[PDB]
Design a protein around this nucleic acid. Sequence first.
DNA 1: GTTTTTAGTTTATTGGGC
DNA 2: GCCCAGCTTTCCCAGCTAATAAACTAAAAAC
Lengths: 530, 493
Amino acid sequence: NKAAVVLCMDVGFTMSNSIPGIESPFEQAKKVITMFVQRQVFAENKDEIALVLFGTDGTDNPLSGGDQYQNITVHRHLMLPDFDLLEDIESKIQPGSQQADFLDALIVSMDVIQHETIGKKFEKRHIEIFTDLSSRFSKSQLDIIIHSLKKCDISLQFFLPFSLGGPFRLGGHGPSFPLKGITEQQKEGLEIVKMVMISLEGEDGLDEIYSFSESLRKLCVFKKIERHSIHWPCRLTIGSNLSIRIAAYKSILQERVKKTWTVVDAKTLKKEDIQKETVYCLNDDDETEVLKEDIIQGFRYGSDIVPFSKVDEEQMKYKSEGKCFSVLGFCKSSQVQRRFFMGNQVLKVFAARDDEAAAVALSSLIHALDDLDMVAIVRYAYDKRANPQVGVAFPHIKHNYECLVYVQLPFMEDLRQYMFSSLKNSKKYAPTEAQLNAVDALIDSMSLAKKDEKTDTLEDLFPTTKIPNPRFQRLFQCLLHRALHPREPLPPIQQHIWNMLNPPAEVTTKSQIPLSKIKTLFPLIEAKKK
Amino acid sequence: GRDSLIFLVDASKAMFESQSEDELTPFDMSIQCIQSVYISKIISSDRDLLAVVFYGTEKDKNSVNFKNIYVLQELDNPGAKRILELDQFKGQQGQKRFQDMMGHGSDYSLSEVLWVCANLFSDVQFKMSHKRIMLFTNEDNPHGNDSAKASRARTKAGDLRDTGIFLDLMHLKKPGGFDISLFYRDIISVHFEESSKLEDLLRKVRAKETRKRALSRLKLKLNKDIVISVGIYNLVQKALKPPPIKLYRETNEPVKTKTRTFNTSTGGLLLPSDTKRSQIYGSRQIILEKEETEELKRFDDPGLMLMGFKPLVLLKKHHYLRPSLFVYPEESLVIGSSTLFSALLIKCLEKEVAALCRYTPRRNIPPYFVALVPQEEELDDQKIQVTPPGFQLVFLPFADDKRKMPFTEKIMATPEQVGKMKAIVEKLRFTYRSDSFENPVLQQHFRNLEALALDLMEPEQAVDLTLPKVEAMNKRLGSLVDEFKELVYPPDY
DNA sequence: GTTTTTAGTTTATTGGGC
DNA sequence: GCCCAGCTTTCCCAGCTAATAAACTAAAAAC
């Protein structure tokens, strides 16, 4: 429902070491943090955010008592983020000249969550650290640190200049600073970070360590504070004597902008100053107006015009029993092709929460369909109001959970049987042998996968479903830009965004020659006639 | 902008003969199939013009008074009355109404018949695009006994082709089969097989009741220099309940609607350049020009930019986001597009790979990653194109479109329980077909309009094909249900 | 130019046991 | 019909938030 987050940033001397053309850790981390704070601000959540900085010249934190935890500053205390936070991040906060103990920074970060979440109810407490692990630090508080994170249910994530698992492109797909290019001090710091994450998360803890570069092209910084989805209760029925309590969640659902643009007067910049009046007139010539007390509702039936009031339509209107998830039958999965998928969502269906009997029952169905290579064709209706849908429910068996995946199928009235000329049997467009080989070479050069780490596994080199929809952070950059600089026009798209929307530089480079052969083998010219 | 389709039906003796079966006569099949197109054209607000002509009738009705040709319905937009009229010839009683209203089994000369049809295209006051004649007959050699007629029919058939009119043959079953090589090979403008069931005649006709209509013609850029043109089509599109329309009570005439915006104080009309866009966060206002709210949406120019090729196994079935589109080469814009396209298709198929692309449908729209999935052509036993050759444009979700969910311990069923369910699954097995279900809501909506436009005794009530046949299923399952329950549900549930 | 399609709004109707 | 449920930068008296899909309005591009 709400979450408490502490961004623990490293602004120590080393964070500014600028590589000829390659952004410094400080600037990279600064972009990641802005990315996170922007989304929290413009989405208007209730999450509370604090910002701790370490490696600063001064010292200002509630633990300095006794010349300890020096050069650690709590720049912002726990409270809703705002435009003043973003501005500081963008303009006020400067790089430091010192170096602080990063585990000490973490302790101060934990303190903020422990002393300030006081009374307030937070479902989640989280700490994100951004550092280059350049300096020395103490390891005497390790057990203390882990014991408090677990007991206080505080999760953790790390963000570094290098990945954990050539031309550098921020947010791109391909670079991997070899763990050899890092100093020895950094290798020590990294081992500790690894140990900590493994104690807190286990094997998957390694997955919570990111490079600033990859962070800019993921939603990982929000990962531990994401709004959990709402469940939909219902019974999966087979006949009228077999019911199975289930709960559905939406797996895929297009994310959309929430804030709408309000049209306002260019002078008062107020909404009340604007008003819209929609008038009616005889569409045919002699544009004569008509009063609202003379217009009725109607529909077209081909060339016919049929008056049908909303009152009459309300009663003759098709009406259903209501909510439901009824099996109509089962068929071979082959008879259901993905190209026929409909709707704007995917639903995962599980057994009702905490109902073992329902779970076993559903598990029976899932495995039977899987073992029979079949699927269920069902009637789905959100509620008594929603138009009912026919759809498919297919088995989804994993190691952590099992479920049915629901996707709507089409109604006959949704289909279009456009015939298209055959291309295989083409006596006009069949490619020559050379053209086929050029395309064959193009496809190999531009491969977006690779059987790496030799395990017969396919490594996707350009996994687009992990990349965030660019329109959002683009919108945020603009909204913020207009806020902090009203007279300035909108800024151009940030390069890292472009860098994440393009394939690995490796891919682009390999295709050049092949693309060149294709340009000469396949003549292409724009029509002048017809 | 309006395509034209004339339905031409043979009224010869054999059209009214089922040929001894549990099937309809070729004539009944034809009438019923024509009604269907009329109604579907209404369901989707199609603006095409439909016509209905019969030949071989004893009665004639056409502007030139050619004998044995009956123009039941001239080219015009379909409506309630025209549909109701066609229904009068449906079934065995219909057969009687048709024969008593026009007669049947009379002589005729195809040439005269085609002249009358071509003339219906000329009488159209509207401007037309495609001019098509669909012929329904189970006679494969009309004038094998009269060269004077056979010859005139070929000439006229040829004149149609030169004149831009297309003649499609919907040949119906005949003893020994319908042989197109005998006569129609030189008339029509692999061919579909003969139809013997309404179902088949319907699909073959549906495959031609509407011409291709691209959703957009775009450039598919392999890079900046190598660009081909493609058509994007929606082979699937959610048929919606047509929106209402405002009428003038005293004449039921449609009304125009003008929406203006004016300053509240002065009452003056507000130009688009007299208003700005606002968004309020916290206690701060951020103002942008309309032009800027569109600009922040701008990324790529409209088109498909190739990112590379990704093996199909890496694309998950459960990542569906919204309906897929279909991509086909548009040779009319960039000559050479089809060849390159075909090659890409042939090779993507052999390598079981997909073409990943950044897609922008129109100007000022953020990009979406899509996977062009190779799709090989498929014809069924009737020679109907079940699957068109090309690429399935599969939309890929961005990370934001994905939703996480917590999971508790995995609880699995025993082989004995899964076995019981297997037995149940096998009992309710059936053959799924993408066109087996009708939309309860749309159907009822038009049945309702029909009752109001034709003043029927009552609104026909649609049959919800989405509702499970409960009773039947229960009997079909027998004790399997009670059995399953004993293996899973504690009596104390 | 007019018509289909879609992103952007809009606002109410909706669940479920007793 | 009648209201449940909880949490607090509105306050614990109360207020009001929510989920989401059918409807509807507006702008781009196909024809």
